[PDB]
Design a protein around this nucleic acid. Sequence first.
RNA 1: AACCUGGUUGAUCUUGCCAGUAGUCAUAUGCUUGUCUCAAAGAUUAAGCCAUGCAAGUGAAAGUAUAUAUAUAUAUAUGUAGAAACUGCGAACGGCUCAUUAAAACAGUUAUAGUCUACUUGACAUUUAUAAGGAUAACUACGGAAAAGCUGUAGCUAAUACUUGCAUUAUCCUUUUGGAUAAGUAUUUGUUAGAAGGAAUUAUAACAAAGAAGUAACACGUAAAGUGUGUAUCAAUCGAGUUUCUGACCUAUCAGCUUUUGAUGUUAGGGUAUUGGCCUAACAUGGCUAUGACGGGUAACGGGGAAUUAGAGUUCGAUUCCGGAGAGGGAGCCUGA
RNA 2: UUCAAAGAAUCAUUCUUUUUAAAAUCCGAUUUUGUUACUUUGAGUA
RNA 3: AAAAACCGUAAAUCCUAUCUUUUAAAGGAAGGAGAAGUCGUAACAAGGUUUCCGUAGGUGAACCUGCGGAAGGAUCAU
RNA 4: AAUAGAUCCGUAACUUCGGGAAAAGGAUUGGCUCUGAGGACAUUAAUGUUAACUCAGAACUGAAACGGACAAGGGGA
Lengths: 257, 171, 146
Amino acid sequence: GKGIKKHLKRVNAPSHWMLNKMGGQYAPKTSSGPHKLLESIPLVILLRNRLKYALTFDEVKMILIQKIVKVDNKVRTDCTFPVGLMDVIHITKSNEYFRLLYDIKGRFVPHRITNEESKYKLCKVKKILLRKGRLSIAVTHDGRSIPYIHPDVKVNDTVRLDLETGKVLEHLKFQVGSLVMVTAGHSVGRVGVISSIDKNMGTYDIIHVKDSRNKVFATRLSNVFVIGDNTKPYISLPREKGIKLDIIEERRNRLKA
Amino acid sequence: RDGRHKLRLTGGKKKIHKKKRKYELGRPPSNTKLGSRQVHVVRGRGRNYKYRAIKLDSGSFSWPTFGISKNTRIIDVVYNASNNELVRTKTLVKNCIVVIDSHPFTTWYENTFGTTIGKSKNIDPLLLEQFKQGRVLACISSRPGQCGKADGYIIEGDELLFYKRKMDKRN
Amino acid sequence: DVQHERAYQKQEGASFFNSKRYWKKVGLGFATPKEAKEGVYVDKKCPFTGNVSIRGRILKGMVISNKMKRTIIIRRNYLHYVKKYNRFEKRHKNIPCHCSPCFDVKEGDIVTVGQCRPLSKTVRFNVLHVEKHQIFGSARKQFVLF
RNA sequence: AACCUGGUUGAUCUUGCCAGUAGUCAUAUGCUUGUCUCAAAGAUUAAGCCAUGCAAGUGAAAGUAUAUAUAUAUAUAUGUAGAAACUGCGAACGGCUCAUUAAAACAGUUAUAGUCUACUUGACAUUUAUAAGGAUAACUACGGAAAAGCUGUAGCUAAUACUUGCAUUAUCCUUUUGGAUAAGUAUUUGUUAGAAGGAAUUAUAACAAAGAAGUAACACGUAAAGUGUGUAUCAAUCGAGUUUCUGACCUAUCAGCUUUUGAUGUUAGGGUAUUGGCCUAACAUGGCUAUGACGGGUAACGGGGAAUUAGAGUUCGAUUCCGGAGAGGGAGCCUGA
RNA sequence: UUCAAAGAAUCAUUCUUUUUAAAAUCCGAUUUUGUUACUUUGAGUA
RNA sequence: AAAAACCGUAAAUCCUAUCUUUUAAAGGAAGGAGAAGUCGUAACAAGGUUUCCGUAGGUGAACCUGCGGAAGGAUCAU
RNA sequence: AAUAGAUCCGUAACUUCGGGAAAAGGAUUGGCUCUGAGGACAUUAAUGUUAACUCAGAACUGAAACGGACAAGGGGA
């Protein structure tokens, strides 16, 4: 037969997983869930290869059996569970809160967050569907369906979501002043202010985004995530703060130590 | 049973590898006659069920100028645009022309409108005479081989004139 | 007058009884012809009148034959780059397109066509706009840079 | 490292080839071989034939246990386990090979407004009840056959196997509150109105007809109420089928092919998960071609790539990954997402 | 088939910037003016 | 449930035809190589009839002859 | 003795390019019930009256038989 493939070769695994060539022949194929395989990491590699808490897949299973780690404040026990673009990971035994984010080099990093911040996740609405009774549901990047969204919410907006109650707290638009984070391009991981939006009829819409140091980079509309307004990002950011640097001058700051 | 083994657009013959797949399928046709209601179940892809009707007597039929649907029984099949064998062997297909009982429609008209929503449509004489006869012409609109039920609407106006001329400068 | 072969195409979406001719906009900057808007023909495969939706890619081409019913043959001429010799060679290939009767096409005319769902064994494109173009010689012998 | 040298003459300068020279993740073979690291390996020919053994099974809270064993206060209640078997899930992944295949497959680039989609994730439902029915495995007894992953009859019992079946919500108005009104998820048909898309016969809403399948008669226990299993629809996800444009080696001592036998298109239907001559009926005479159609050859699976490179190029790519195809050759089919 | 002049900075030069017909935009000033090849930048790049 | 029929999917076998590849063969007729073989002297000198081309006929063979050409001629020239 | 009519299909070497050729070699054929196509004539684009047998297609039917008798090439190297 020719049903669904269920194995992942190591070299065929996504590059940002950073799995080594000689470390076996297979990679953990993420289970279907909230996020795409390409734009997520399984928590097995999250807490084996990144946090180094576990040394083997069996040790990952050992961690997961005890209902300790929670993804969006709810317990996850699947070994190949897709954690996804941005959300909170709570480990109760060590009492630590992580937010999954992108570094300026396009890789998934667990960024330390406070307990207070671990309740404020950001969701990028991807569709607005009205079902029976003129009731509107927002489908987000998280694969999550939020019924009864505020009618002002648009298809490329973002909404702050409360993990405990699963409710929207406020929304964020996509003007030319709303700061965004790029998610999948050459400029994956950059944080900018959106200089302009060019809407091509029937093709990909492009948006030009201005960095903090006034350098402009363009990207596809589907590959951005509104984070905040011009005032500040609504979430905390990794140490680079979404600021990518030219390689010729990353070397100088590497050398000065 | 779909896609390959034909000639190319240029008329050339294409060599055939890739033996037949299941998803190409091609189930045999259902020559739905009219008779005591009997349908079978076909398990299509994804365990979706398709109702293959073999015989029907009745079905929903719509008076479209009033937009009202009533269940009636199919008396005969008299015309079909495709193969003329279909009417002769009395098979029900999607665009078939049938003769159905009009008594439910006449009784409904008497009950609601009186006499023999957006009411007062004024009817037409060509359909009125058919009602007076008691059997009325209709066009099927469902696919009995797919949905398992014959169902259609009463033809009126220019299309009714067209089909009446085509059935019976004429023989 | 409105139908001659064994059919009248119902023109799904026309509506005949309550309402308040059927046509759409197609979009992509193309204007629905006044002939499609007002005329009495009915075409199930017309982009402005039928069920088909224009989605995919838009191509420009030269009409090569309009001698089969409601569908035409478009030849697209282009230059293929041969790397080793660092120069180009003339190349072509023709694509069958559906031409709704709202357009009056003749051999030699440039037409723009939009991709639609497969309407037949070979056609996947529907004409959207026609501008006349006088030709001299066989239409296949012309080379239009488009 | 952007390189040349010997050979036609009595001698000369050319053309011109032969020979030399070096590399090959390029094969074989000869001679020889003290260490360590690294590691290709029945592709070439025979997708030839195969003895033998193994290669897909699965129960740690959570379907069904008087096969059976055990332990606590005393035949009582708890348990702990548990062969077999029924049930559930998987076995459609993986692994192998390169025969077929020359606009086919594949690659980049699209579309699916023409579709299907198990597990998993998020939402979340409609026309006897202190809990309903038979019928079967395991097992018991009698058996048959040289033999097999063969099984007959009789007797019982379960189940998340198979099958029946038990409130309520919303809306109008005087205007927290009183009366009043209404009740089908998908899917199909007819008549209408109409947050997004690029464009809707869209979402959705109303009316008139049908109408599946369901909404727990199921099992274990977390805060000093939870979970498992199952279920309608939508969405997500893991994918898949078709699909747009463009891109291939040699051959014209292959120039006209295709079209009764579907070839190209229209109309109507059937069929499909969906579009489509995919098939059927009628109709029209179309479609491709020296920019190489149609044929023939390939010791041709395609690509990522490899060797050699000053720059161009030339040759290779069965073989780590991706896609395709096949399981001696064909064809057909069941279960199942 | 739309040509040039003028102004700051290295070293003697080189280099940077403004306007100069006509039609629609703003009450003397506010700003778009064929198609493609080709070329430049990006996007998407296992 | 056996069983039967009819559309369809259609393996497989046989006949016929065509094509492709390989292959036998009396006889015929070439090419290449070898050896001091036999016969002549065609060409290279004006090679002893200048050579050569196209064509046609003839002869043991090289070759000869007719017609029309070329100089790559043995003439750059009253 | 073997077919041998008709319709449809297919037809080689060779050739004086005209033929060979009915080459060779295949299939079908009854009855019945139907369907489709092929004309002429008059009224103020449209509606009636009326005629030949000639083809094509489909169901059904029978002890698989149908140019049923009659009539009627054997081919090839």
